[PDB]
Ligand binder design. Structure first.
Ligand SMILES: COc1cc2c(NC3CCN(C)CC3)nc(N3CCCN(C)CC3)nc2cc1OCCCN(C)C
Ligand SMILES: Nc1ncnc2c1ncn2[C@@H]1O[C@H](CSCC[C@H](N)C(=O)O)[C@@H](O)[C@H]1O
Ligand SMILES: [Cl-]
Ligand SMILES: [Cl-]
Ligand SMILES: [Zn+2]
Ligand SMILES: [Zn+2]
Ligand SMILES: [Zn+2]
Ligand SMILES: [Zn+2]
Length: 272
């Protein structure tokens, strides 16, 4: 059985780079049960605050690399280095909110605080995994702290999420009324990223063209150096697995697996 290229670009030209789809495992064609979108969509009135006068913004007359950048200060500091990668000191456990520069800033569109809004730069592939359906892998080495892709989908209310049958593609935007990104019907490449118990990417809340704090955009950055061919994955969290472990178990394969049939059996036994 050969590896076949089934789609030259699942994004249909909407990303900076093509994202091909291949299958070397089984006879499944390229997934078509969803609509690919490169940016979040709305299917109801969300009333996002898009008032330009409500934007906090910088007065920077340089490239925004000084500690005088208001946008950086909103993030404690700008966390991007000269090549757009998170600093080694970045809090990978409890990430701060990132405020990127925006249309109200005095700075230029190429300033040092515009990583997420510049879109996908790394080379990714949608591929058929052995045991986890479709997944997303790197076609190249990716240093720690590199922006990968955004978690994109349909913005829905908590109450709408509570009525959705298929909850397998939900990303929660928790706050203190709350919202979800549902990637089931409308999503980007991130909808295909599997759970790994030892993750190589972390989600980060970012603000760009608006600063309505109810609607952070979710940016995945590598949490360590990623090798060519390595499957991308993040921790779906204990909530997902509480609901789902009764239906299927984790196939991540890691010695550190917390959600496999074996690991679940050890915990059920260790309970006695
Ligand atoms: C199965 O994984 C998740 C399920 C749900 C879920 N599920 C059900 C919807 C249909 N009803 C009948 C029962 C609940 N509801 C909600 N929310 C939003 C916040 C809390 N609200 C009070 C409840 C509505 N969030 C979820 C988040 C999930 O994983 C997120 C991480 C993994 N992603 C990245 C793949
Ligand atoms: N570690 C893991 N073990 C087993 N199945 C997983 C997994 N991570 C993700 N999945 C599967 O993928 C769903 C999340 S959506 C991720 C893409 C999915 N593999 C697909 O083919 O479309 C989960 O509900 C589960 O069905
Ligand atoms: Cl094609
Ligand atoms: Cl409102
Ligand atoms: Zn600035
Ligand atoms: Zn700037
Ligand atoms: Zn700015
Ligand atoms: Zn696992």
């Amino acid at each position: 059985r050969t590896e076949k290229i089934i789609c030259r670009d699942v994004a249909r030209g909407y990303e900076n780079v093509p994202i091909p789809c291949v299958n070397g495992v089984d006879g499944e064609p390229c997934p078509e049960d969803y609509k690919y979108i490169s940016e979040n969509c709305e299917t109801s009135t969300m009333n996002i605050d898009r008032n330009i006068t409500h934007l906090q913004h910088c007065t920077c007359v340089d490239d925004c690399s000084s500690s005088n950048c208001l946008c950086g200060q909103l993030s404690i500091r700008c966390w991007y280095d000269k090549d757009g990668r998170l600093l080694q000191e970045f809090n990978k456990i409890e990430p701060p909110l990132i405020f990127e520069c925006n249309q109200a800033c005095s700075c230029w569109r190429n300033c040092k605080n515009r990583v997420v809004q510049s879109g996908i730069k790394v080379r990714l592939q949608l591929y058929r995994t052995a045991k986890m359906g479709w997944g997303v892998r790197a076609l190249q080495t990716i240093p720690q702290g590199t922006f990968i892709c955004e978690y994109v989908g349909e913005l829905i209310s908590d109450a709408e999420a509570d009525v959705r049958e298929d909850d397998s593609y939900l990303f929660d935007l928790d706050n203190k009324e709350v919202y979800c990104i549902d990637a089931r019907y409308y999503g980007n490449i991130s909808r295909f990223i599997n759970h790994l118990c030892d993750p190589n990417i972390i989600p980060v809340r970012v603000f760009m063209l608006h600063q309505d704090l109810r609607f952070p955009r979710i940016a995945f950055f590598s949490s360590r150096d990623i090798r060519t061919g390595e499957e991308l994955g993040f921790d779906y969290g204990d909530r997902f697995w509480d609901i789902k472990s009764k239906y299927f178990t984790c196939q991540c394969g890691s010695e550190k697996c917390k959600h496999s049939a074996e690991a679940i059996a050890l915990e059920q036994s260790r309970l006695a």
